[PDB]
């Protein structure tokens, strides 16, 4: 019955591990921005293989669960930095925290 | 067409690789529980980085929303700090009989 | 205000790292077929532990994730059901931006 | 931050206003059984027009909507499938606050 | 591809037609508030029958499709006014407008 | 268990009872279209009140998300002002064969 929010969204950012932004690993910059943006949190996963119609470059997935508006901000910031990968989003229910 | 269940939910427990319980790893204890409560199954992942050093540990469980809640109750207290999430999903297959 | 595709779904296939199909690592076989079929993409994860409903506990979980249009996913599931023994396949909507 | 129930779903049953089951208006029969079973609730709508895949065009649509926990909906669908001829039953999640 | 929003929510308010608030029909007051609240819009339906474990009182359903935050406001305003009925919410995608 | 489709979407077209097209009621014209494009089916509702006198008219269509989009294109222009919505749904049955 108790839930933090019912309009929470799960954002997933798929990029290659070697993708770069101004010489730095794109995922680190992305995670860096999320931090100074005051976003709830994030989890980064590294796949063992991946491919996108549109492998020395393992997949890295940056996942962020937050309120809708916050996630909209993030997409608007990160869209420019990503020329190859994908961004998905779907609702989810957050039950606990700390 | 055929599916296994259209009433299932995906439970995701986000904790810390270093989180402990009564002396043991919080994820190993949870999985033990889940296995003794008769849950459908579970899959544990370890991220490379996370913020909410410590590696994020995510135990995932897909089952009747009615087992998931049974699971939520028994774990809500053990998770002093972290996050629990849940959302619908359809289980299309398991692969017990081929035809 | 602009999303890439119409009706996309996220397929997740769970199997064992040690699973095989005709002497080959089942997941690589699955990924291969997906590519051949012309699927939008796929990501493969390796878990550190997992259990279901006779498999070694040291047999790590492998999750093959595919995000694509509905008919495509339908087609994928149609092709890989025969190769999934005692695993699991899930699907649910998502929006790809 | 407080929702009433865990895993609720919205069942929608589509049938014809003129449909019958043992000489009675099928929808009233469905609603009756739902009540007997102890279902959380139900709402019935009457459309002004509808068509599917031999029924009069003047035979208005009747939609029986049920919002309840998963197992309950499972049970409902199990009971009314036999009474639904050339209609439609849909389901999808929802959160009841 | 073109969509107004991806974090739109469909809110549904189920009450009886005779339900009242300070002597006026509860649904009219509800619709009245939504209007002076600047909400996107709303559609009211009247069922031909209904029942809630928790019929001379036909069901009235007030439906509102809007951004998440707006819908949160609405729930917070209307929750007090409703002692018998139900409030559901799930995501939806808005494609067009005017 | 068995279902009809887990890939379907529910399309909802909100217009005005008085909205017209080339001289006819916008909803009657849409339904005509939907029937000639071979869509699974449709259900039309008339609210008692709405604001976005005029009665709100809602044509609902459940079908492959691939027919729904075919439908969206052909109607987006006809709907000068109103609203179109879409979201997933599972079609559990149709009732053609009992067993
Ligand atoms: N449709 C998809 N489904 C699952 N994973 C995807 C999909 N599309 C892209 N990816 C992942 O994102 C990465 C794409 O990187 P890139 O090819 O440079 O655009 C791949 O390594 C995949 O693991
Ligand atoms: N209900 C479930 N929830 C999460 N993962 C599952 C579930 N069921 C099966 N799996 C995964 O699929 C595999 C099942 O194979 P097995 O242990 O031989 O039955 C495990 O390694 C799990 O990672
Ligand atoms: N909103 C979120 N989205 C994605 N991952 C999260 C989120 N919140 C927490 N996490 C992860 O879950 C773990 C628990 O949070 P913490 O106790 O602060 O370390 C962290 O290691 C994070 O990586
Ligand atoms: N679980 C439900 N599913 C569908 N409709 C419901 C449900 N619960 C309540 N309703 C509708 O909301 C109204 C409840 O009013 P009341 O009994 O006064 O609380 C009924 O007339 C029903 O049409
Ligand atoms: N795909 C659909 N979308 C919306 N309503 C439907 C759909 N299929 C069936 N229906 C409803 O179910 C009834 C079908 O019965 P029939 O016309 O005899 O085949 C119609 O009156 C519709 O209101
Ligand atoms: N956001 C919304 N939620 C529920 N109903 C709506 C919404 N927006 C528009 N409508 C309905 O759709 C119809 C079209 O809007 P309008 O052209 O302004 O009259 C109206 O009669 C409203 O009742």
Tab-separated table of C-alpha atoms in Angstrom, chain B residues 6, chain D residues 11 73 77 81 88-91, chain F residues 1-5 8 90-94:
chain	number	residue	atom	x	y	z
B	6	UNK	CA	-0.281	-12.145	-17.891
D	11	UNK	CA	-10.776	-6.079	-17.227
D	73	UNK	CA	-9.495	-11.134	-12.565
D	77	UNK	CA	-12.141	-14.456	-16.926
D	81	UNK	CA	-15.201	-17.064	-21.255
D	88	UNK	CA	-13.824	-9.339	-26.616
D	89	UNK	CA	-12.049	-9.298	-23.298
D	90	UNK	CA	-9.093	-7.037	-22.564
D	91	UNK	CA	-6.908	-6.446	-19.569
F	1	UNK	CA	-2.754	-20.141	-20.449
F	2	UNK	CA	-4.158	-18.711	-23.699
F	3	UNK	CA	-4.670	-15.176	-24.977
F	4	UNK	CA	-5.477	-13.679	-28.381
F	5	UNK	CA	-2.696	-11.077	-28.508
F	8	UNK	CA	-2.269	-5.002	-29.100
F	90	UNK	CA	-3.820	-7.503	-23.810
F	91	UNK	CA	-6.676	-9.103	-25.748
F	92	UNK	CA	-7.501	-12.226	-23.748
F	93	UNK	CA	-10.345	-13.571	-25.827
F	94	UNK	CA	-12.851	-13.195	-28.646
